[PDB]
Amino acid sequence: PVEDLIRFYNDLQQYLNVVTRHRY
Amino acid sequence: GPSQPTYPG
Known part of the structure; x- marks a missing residue:
């Protein structure tokens, strides 16, 4: 599948979209 | 608790 x-x-x-989007 | 630990094969 x-x-x-x-x-x-x-x-x-x-x-990388839930951590760096709030830290970068 | 193991929610839904789906895995590749």
Whole structure:
């Protein structure tokens, strides 16, 4: 399932979009 | 609690 692959990738982006978006 | 720990394969 491509959906699972995308979710696992999206997590790496979310950690940079919820942390650095409030600290950078 | 393990919410939804889905994983690749």
